[PDB]
Structure 1
Amino acid sequence: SGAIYVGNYRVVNRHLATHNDWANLVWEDSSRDLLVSSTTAQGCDTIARCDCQTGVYYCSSRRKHYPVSFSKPSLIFVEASEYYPARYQSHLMLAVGHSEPGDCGGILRCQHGVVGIVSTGGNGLVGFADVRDLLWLDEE
């Protein structure tokens, strides 16, 4: 689990969104595994606006932050899971790293701020849903 809190927005994995998230919905995209809801309190995270390919992510199944090299956001085939059939997920970046299903939501960050959140994985790979192109998260 986990979320990004920027401005009056909460960014979560679409497959982990709560009823309160759906009842306060701003935007959702199943192909990206992302959902954004509105919040009453202002958050403290800043979004990275860059092309970094190295950063650090939080892995809840290890209680550790790991430095990683990750691919550019792309259209990647993701195996069937409890939440989606086997399909292509867009704006996904892959890295070598430990992940388990409940690791979704962990933040990947670089020197500029938050880059995205854990969304996929298995067999020593971890995939992150990018948020750097969502410029509207910085305003309103």
Structure 2
Amino acid sequence: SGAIYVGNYRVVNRHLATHNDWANLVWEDSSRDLLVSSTTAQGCDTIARCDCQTGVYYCSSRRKHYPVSFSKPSLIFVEASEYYPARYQSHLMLAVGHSEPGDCGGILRCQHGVVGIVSTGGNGLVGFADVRDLLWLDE
């Protein structure tokens, strides 16, 4: 689990969004595993606007942060799960690192701010949904 709180927005994995997220929906994209909802309180986070390919993510299944080198956001095949049919997930970045299903929502950051959130993984890989292209989160 986990979320990004920026301005009056909450960014979560679409497959983990709550009834309240859907009732206050701003935008969602099943191909990216992202959902953004509106909030009343001002958020705690800043979004990176950069091309970094190194950063640090939080891994809840180890209670630790790990440094990672990750690929540029791209269209990557993701196998069927309880949450989605087999499909290409867009704006996804892969890295070598530990992840388990409950790790979704962990934040990846670089020196500029929040880069994205854990969305996929397995077999020593971890995949992050990028949010750096969502310029409207900043206003």
**TM class by shorter-chain length?**
over 0.9
d(CA) in 2 for partners of 1:18, 1:4: 14
Residue 42 of structure 1: CA displacement?
0.3
After TM superposition, give the deviation of residue 67 of structure 1 in Å.
Answer: 0.2
Residue in 2 that maps onto 1:106: 106
In the TM superposition, what whole-angstrom CA distance separates every residue of 1:29-73 from its partner, at most 9, and x where no partner exists? Answer: 000000000001001100000000000000000000000000000
Q: Distance in 1 between matches of 2:43 and 2:56?
A: 20
TM-score normalised per structure 2: 0.99
For structure 2, list consecutive stretches of 5 or more residues without a partner in the other structure.
none
User: Displacement, 1:108?
Assistant: 0.2
d(CA) in 1 for partners of 2:35, 2:72 = 21
TM-score (norm 1): 0.98
**Identity percentage of aligned residues:** 100
Distance 1:58 1:34 in 2: 18
Per-residue CA distance 1:68-103 (angstroms, 9 max, x = gap): 000000000011111011110000000000000010
Quick one: distance in 2 between partners of 1:27 and 1:57?
24
- Distance in 1 (alpha carbons) for counterparts of 2:85 and 2:23: 25
Q: Distance in 2 between matches of 1:44 and 1:29?
A: 23
> Secondary structure, in 3 states, of the residue corresponding to 2:121?
strand
